Design a protein around this ligand. Structure first.
Ligand SMILES: *[C@@H]1O[C@H](CO)[C@@H](O[C@@H]2O[C@H](CO)[C@@H](O)[C@H](O)[C@H]2NC(C)=O)[C@H](O)[C@H]1NC(C)=O
Ligand SMILES: *[C@@H]1O[C@H](CO)[C@@H](O[C@@H]2O[C@H](CO)[C@@H](O)[C@H](O)[C@H]2NC(C)=O)[C@H](O)[C@H]1NC(C)=O
Ligand SMILES: *[C@@H]1O[C@H](CO)[C@@H](O[C@@H]2O[C@H](CO)[C@@H](O)[C@H](O)[C@H]2NC(C)=O)[C@H](O)[C@H]1NC(C)=O
Ligand SMILES: *[C@@H]1O[C@H](CO)[C@@H](O[C@@H]2O[C@H](CO)[C@@H](O)[C@H](O)[C@H]2NC(C)=O)[C@H](O)[C@H]1NC(C)=O
Ligand code: NAG
Ligand code: NAG
Ligand code: NAG
Lengths: 73, 228, 313
């Protein structure tokens, strides 16, 4: 099996038209991942998820409730 | 306070689970500790390299060769090994500033974040920062940032001011909002709607200029107190 | 204008030294790990060169985008909100920038993990979440707030009561709008505006040329073409002459790498400074005087630029 990238010649992994978070970043935004029976796919990463905020000049959204998240640095 | 108590208590718990099963957290520390032993091995192996001299055991020349040739060979060892130190010494100096730069970043967080409350956004961790708890780890430090992340949104119709008599009332602290009938002035980062009275709102200008202002009555604290 | 990442580059620690030649390959094996400590080094840069770009640009969970219709109260961001026309969607400014700033000996150039049309989705997201949602997308889910009611919360941050804003709104828009245009004329005619970025891209390409020319130098070896010494001399003689080449062509790498490491740790610093502005200045509002630029600070708009970021404070 053979693919062709912007990064180089990729061999042994299957193209996928879908787009997920980046996993084994390679080059030019081609992030290989083993999720799929299984095989190694390679799929253009979609930066982040997607959202579009609903904005209108009188529309405000106030959080009514909170959490407390202890992180680690 | 109760609900906050549990949210924090739980939160500490989940840490221990991220730390129990997972090696991804401590990569930073772990990656540092390797890069040394990495270099040291490299630094050690460089002993056994020929560097072009007849052998890398410094006295197995001397048995083979009469000194004046060894004096030529032992150069290529020295010259080899010596250079191999500077390359190691440098890599320490460079790396030692890759730590030294991180120290100051901790020496900051240890001051501003722990000892203070840091307004700097996403410095003390994503969300609004309440406090932080340091914990030591080998050749490193681990901060537990207790951060405040808001949760449940609700849409609201807002207005940048309110016309009462033609004066414009603006909120002293927080936004005007409404759920679609009554007008509430509330604080911004949490929802506690409060009736709009002249102590929530300071008069300014008047109503023709504002862009977006809406009608309403701003209730007088005092007027009721009167009539008797 | 801050450098963020530099050009990810690897090098072949062997071919660069010994071109196409096993005769020289042997005598490299003597020196041992001087080959692979390099690739250990030059990769430990090219590894993080995408951590730099990572920390700076992706501070945002989700890739937002503007609402379809722009009414922000009179502010005109059409300059900075991404051009739908150009297939790479880079808001009108950023296309200025990309005009300014502008495969042989084992020397490679690795592709930056994030192509521009990616980087320009982030700096669209950030720039397009800052508009509607204010800072609240750095503290959690983006909370839509009317941009005209946002600025009033960025005046309470500089100590100006908000009634200044709404009454002076119009004038402020014109002062904002007009102030954008200049930034386009400012950048338009002058190549010494981006010099920082321009200098980085130079310094690398400056160093690569320097590295490459070394292959043409004698170092006391009778020729700089390895094949020569091989052909005309008997091996025990070439054993020596090729050392000075190797020694030279090696001592020329360590020089080169040690540069990059330093220079990277310079970028590594500038990245952290950008990721600090992007975090503090862009997302929230900064109380740190003259960190966000001369004057009190209202907001900031990131704009990508080749191997760099550019803020509009
Ligand atoms: C605010 O959100 C929290 C979630 O973090 C809510 O917590 C739960 O509230 C329910 C109430 O029906 C309790 O039965 C649960 O025990 C709570 N869960 C936890 C983990 O504490 C909280 O109720 C919300 N508060 C408001 C006023 O909406
Ligand atoms: C918006 O919120 C306000 C206050 O929370 C609501 O005003 C009260 O709504 C309850 C709902 O049954 C009524 O019983 C009260 O009489 C209302 N107060 C007054 C002073 O009249 C208002 O109804 C809410 N609006 C919506 C659409 O939910
Ligand atoms: C807010 O209410 C005032 C009245 O209290 C409205 O002002 C009136 O607007 C109409 C529009 O032509 C005029 O014909 C009236 O003469 C105005 N009243 C006065 C006393 O001058 C105003 O339009 C309302 N604002 C909004 C946004 O609805
Ligand atoms: C925002 O600015 C852009 C560019 O400055 C405006 O686009 C121009 O609109 C005028 C309309 O009078 C045209 O004559 C120009 O040809 C447009 N220029 C370009 C490059 O398209 C846009 O109209 C402005 N919009 C707002 C709401 O201010
Ligand atoms: C993606 O879609 C194209 C058709 O537009 C198709 O040719 C291609 O095979 C698809 N990719 C995969 C991995 O099937
Ligand atoms: C507010 O309205 C928008 C637009 O329909 C919607 O996407 C959003 O979910 C609403 N808010 C909540 C809390 O559902
Ligand atoms: C808000 O926007 C709507 C449509 O976008 C418009 O009809 C209305 O006049 C605007 N009002 C203000 C105060 O911006």
């Amino acid at each position: 099996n053979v693919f062709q990238t912007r990064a180089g010649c990729l061999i042994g992994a299957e193209h996928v038209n879908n787009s997920y978070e980046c996993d084994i970043p390679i080059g030019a935004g081609i992030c290989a991942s083993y999720q799929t029976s299984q095989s190694i796919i390679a799929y253009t990463m979609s930066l982040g998820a997607e959202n579009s905020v609903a904005y209108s000049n009188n529309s405000i959204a106030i959080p009514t409730n909170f959490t407390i998240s202890v992180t680690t640095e | 306070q109760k609900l906050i108590a549990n949210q924090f208590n739980s939160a500490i718990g989940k840490i221990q689970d991220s730390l129990s099963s997972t090696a991804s957290a401590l990569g930073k520390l772990q990656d540092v500790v390797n890069q040394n032993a990495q270099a040291l091995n490299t630094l050690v192996k460089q002993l056994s390299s020929n560097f072009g001299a007849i052998s890398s055991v410094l006295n197995d020349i001397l048995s083979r060769l009469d000194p004046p040739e060894a004096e030529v060979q032992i150069d290529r060892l020295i010259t080899g090994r010596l250079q191999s130190l500077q390359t190691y010494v440098t890599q320490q100096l460079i790396r030692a500033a890759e730590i030294r730069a991180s120290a100051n970043l901790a020496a900051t967080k240890m001051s501003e974040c722990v000892l203070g409350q840091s307004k700097r956004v996403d410095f003390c961790g994503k969300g609004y920062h309440l406090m932080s708890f340091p914990q030591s780890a080998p050749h490193g430090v681990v901060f537990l940032h207790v951060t405040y992340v808001p949760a449940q949104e609700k849409n609201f119709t807002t207005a940048p001011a309110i016309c009462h008599d033609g004066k414009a009332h603006f909120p002293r602290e927080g936004v005007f909002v409404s759920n679609g009938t009554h007008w509430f002035v509330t604080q911004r980062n949490f929802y506690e709607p409060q009736i709009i009275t002249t102590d929530n709102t300071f008069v300014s200008g008047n109503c023709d200029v504002v862009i977006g202002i809406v009608n309403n009555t701003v209730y007088d604290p005092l007027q009721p107190e009167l009539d008797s | 204008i801050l450098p963020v990442s530099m050009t990810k580059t690897s090098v072949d620690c062997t071919m660069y030294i010994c071109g196409d030649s096993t005769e020289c390959s042997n005598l490299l094996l003597q020196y041992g790990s001087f080959c692979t400590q390099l690739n250990r080094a030059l990769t430990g840069i090219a590894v993080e060169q995408d951590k730099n770009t990572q920390e700076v640009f992706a501070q945002v969970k989700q890739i937002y985008k503007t609402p379809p219709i722009k009414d922000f109260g009179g502010f005109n961001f059409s300059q900075i909100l991404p051009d739908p026309s150009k297939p790479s969607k880079r808001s009108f400014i950023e296309d200025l920038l990309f005009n300014k700033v502008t495969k042989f000996n084992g020397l490679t150039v690795l592709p930056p993990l994030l192509t521009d049309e990616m980087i320009a989705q982030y700096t669209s997201a950030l720039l397009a979440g800052t508009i509607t949602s204010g800072w609240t997308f750095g503290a959690g889910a983006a909370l839509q707030i009317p941009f005209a009611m946002q600025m009033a919360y960025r005046f309470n941050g500089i100590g100006v009561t908000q009634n200044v804003l709404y009454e002076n709104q119009k004038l402020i828009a014109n002062q904002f709008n007009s102030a954008i245009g200049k930034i386009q004329d400012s950048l338009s005619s002058t190549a010494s505006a981006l010099g920082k970025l321009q200098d980085v891209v130079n310094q690398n390409a400056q160093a690569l040329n320097t590295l490459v020319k070394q292959l043409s130098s004698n170092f006391g070896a009778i020729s700089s073409v390895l094949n020569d010494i091989l052909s005309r001399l008997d091996p025990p003689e070439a054993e020596v002459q090729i050392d000075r080449l190797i020694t030279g062509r090696l001592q020329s790498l360590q020089t080169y790498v040690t540069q990059q490491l330093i220079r990277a740790a310079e970028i590594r610093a500038s990245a952290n400074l950008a990721a600090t502005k992007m975090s503090e200045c862009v997302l929230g509002q900064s109380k740190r005087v003259d960190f966000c630029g001369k004057g009190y600070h209202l907001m900031s708009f990131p704009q990508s630029a080749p191997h760099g970021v550019v803020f509009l404070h």
